[PDB]
Design a protein around this nucleic acid. Sequence first.
RNA 1: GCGGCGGCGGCGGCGGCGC
RNA 2: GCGGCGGCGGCGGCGGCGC
Lengths: 121, 121
Amino acid sequence: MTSPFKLPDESPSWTEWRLHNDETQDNPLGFKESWGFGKVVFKRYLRYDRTEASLHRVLGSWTGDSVNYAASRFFGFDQIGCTYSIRFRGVSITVSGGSRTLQHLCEMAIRSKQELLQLAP
Amino acid sequence: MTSPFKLPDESPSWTEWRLHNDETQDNPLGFKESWGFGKVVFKRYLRYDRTEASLHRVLGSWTGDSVNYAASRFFGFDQIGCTYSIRFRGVSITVSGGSRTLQHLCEMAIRSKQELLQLAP
RNA sequence: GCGGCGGCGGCGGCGGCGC
RNA sequence: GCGGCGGCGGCGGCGGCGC
């Protein structure tokens, strides 16, 4: 299937996660995000260290155009449900609606992402 | 039960909603929001016409302090799930997490509300 | 971090019924 | 707008199992 994401997954192995735990969510290795279209879900764990360079990098993981290319594989006459989810430091935000509204869903999803990743410590 | 909201509900009757439909979501009468703490959910339909005065009014419907007073009725040793939901013009945003994180949940909820209600037409 | 599992609650599509 | 209903899929608590 063609993914909505433009960066690959970065999930930590079990060992890497333990080591990180032993040496320090709040300062997790990163955040989790996902895009769902009908019954298909695409998922990413991305490293994030709360700097400006890193924020810039992880905001590039999807665009309205990558999301639309991916989602449109699953479109037809009827509307399907589309959902964006992100979780970081104990907070989950889900942006959801029908595919007819995807352009607005992407606009609110990107804003939600930015705000959550910049949440005051 | 003590509500997290500081404005009363404004749900339209069936007739008022029909009339509004016949004379004009996109330009709905308002938006729907809700606060959930464990298994109890409080809900509001509030009128909103996309002006600055109206935005100011509906942003007063809850505060971090009203939410905390309401939610704390349901607190104890274990953590419970807390969720804020809002829907406007075909887009739903849910902000969710545990009660230990309520202060952050309120910060992201208020930002999500503002952004959604100001969504470019 | 990943994969089951059991409860509880919410959210989005879709179809349909009542007011 | 409100109240059922049937599917499908996500999400959050909680408990627990595997790597």
